[PDB]
């Protein structure tokens, strides 16, 4: 029967890159022709030898990022803000600063002028360090001309959408995101009431790894959310027209690419492909040289529409977990991969490519 061989396919595909990378848990969502399919792996905890489900809770890391994508999508639907806004506009302590002369969009895409990857060990989670540190800034090199992946950069995209809304980013995406999205088990702040869920994330000799504390943290790589929580999200960016419009046309905004770097389009949180692709080409995209060293961007006359023959996607990673998810919008195609080990992203690619080649 069908499930047979889906159960075949994944589990092909998950259960040696489970044992090459030691991953104690791991769970898949899978989105087919309007259908969620779900396979749970493995531990939540080794120690207590909690089992994952679809409902287990894991840090998704950098995948937080398409969730501050969409809020502030929502801020421009709302015409709260614009994407050619020089960023001082929406936080005085920024005017007289060179974000005078940067624009909101070269803050999601990475090409200010080389904010670092992230932000110094001396800056700490406090509001009166963040500011200062921006307001101290100086590029590198020209704004929209080089992207380097940063957590400054996105960080201060989201903190400043949520400033033109007038409201807290944290409490933005609690009180108005999470649940126009119908994502209840999706969050910032994971409450008391819900950590039985919460995975254990594991590093060198197991050593154990919630995500702690930092400077924008919430918009950069805060999110816990479950498997079947992060494929209502998939599901959501597939069919954007089934939510309230305002909701509908802040994920259309993250389906909009800027430039090619490589095979990647880039757009607001998501990173596009071609599909087809190679599984070599797409792991080269979702490579350490593209986290961490500068590129050239190849600009877009005009923004392109992310749809059809594409692969659109996110790795997000932290110290203890490791986090992949990807979409195909003109196949109906949705996928989430989530552990509780930070194993290489081309392994993630890897199953991921598996599933979704299957799949078709
Ligand atoms: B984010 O998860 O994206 C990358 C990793 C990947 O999977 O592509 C990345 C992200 C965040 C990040 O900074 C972090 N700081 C903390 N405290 N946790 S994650 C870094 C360094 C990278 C490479």
């Known amino acids: 029967a069908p499930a047979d061989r889906l159960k075949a396919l994944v589990d ?15 769970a898949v969502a899978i989105s087919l022709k309007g259908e969620p399919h779900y396979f749970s792996y493995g531990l939540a905890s080794k120690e207590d030898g909690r089992r994952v489900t679809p409902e287990t809770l894991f840090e998704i890391g950098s995948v937080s990022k398409t969730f501050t994508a969409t809020l502030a999508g929502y801020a421009l639907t709302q015409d709260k803000m614009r994407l050619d806004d020089r960023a001082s506009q929406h936080w005085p302590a920024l005017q007289g600063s ?3 002369g940067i624009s909101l969009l070269d803050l999601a895409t990475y090409t200010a002028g080389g904010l670092p990857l992230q932000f110094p060990d001396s800056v700490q989670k406090d509001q009166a360090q963040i500011r200062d540190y921006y307001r101290q800034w100086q590029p590198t090199y020209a704004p929209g001309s080089q992207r380097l992946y940063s957590n400054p950069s996105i960080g201060l995209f989201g903190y400043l959408a949520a400033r033109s809304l007038g409201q807290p980013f944290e409490r933005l995406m609690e009180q108005q995101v999470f649940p126009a999205l119908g994502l209840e088990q999706t969050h910032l702040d994971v409450p008391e009431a819900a950590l039985a869920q919460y995975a254990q ?64 389009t880039q757009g607001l949180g998501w990173e596009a492909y071609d599909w087809p692709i190679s599984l070599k080409r797409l792991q080269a995209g979702n490579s350490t040289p593209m986290a961490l060293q500068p590129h050239r961007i190849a600009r877009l006359p005009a923004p392109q529409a992310l749809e059809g023959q594409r692969l659109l996607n996110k790795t997000g990673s932290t110290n203890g977990f490791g986090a992949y998810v990807a979409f195909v919008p003109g196949r109906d195609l949705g996928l989430v991969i989530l552990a509780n080990r930070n ?3 081309a392994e993630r690619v890897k199953i991921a490519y598996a599933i979704l080649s299957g799949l078709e």
């Open 12 to 26: 092909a595909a998950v259960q040696p890159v489970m044992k090459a990378n030691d991953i104690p848990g791991l």
């Open 201 to 264: 994330g594991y590093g060198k000799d197991d050593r154990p790894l919630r995500v702690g504390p930092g400077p924008l943290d919430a918009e950069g790589y805060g999110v816990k959310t479950s498997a079947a929580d992060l494929l209502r999200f998939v599901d959501a960016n597939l069919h954007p027209e089934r939510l309230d419009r305002p909701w509908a046309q802040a994920l259309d905004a993250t389906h909009r690419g800027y430039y090619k770097v490589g095979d990647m």
């Open 343 to 345: 194993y290489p992203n």
């Open 98 to 100: 060179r974000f005078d």
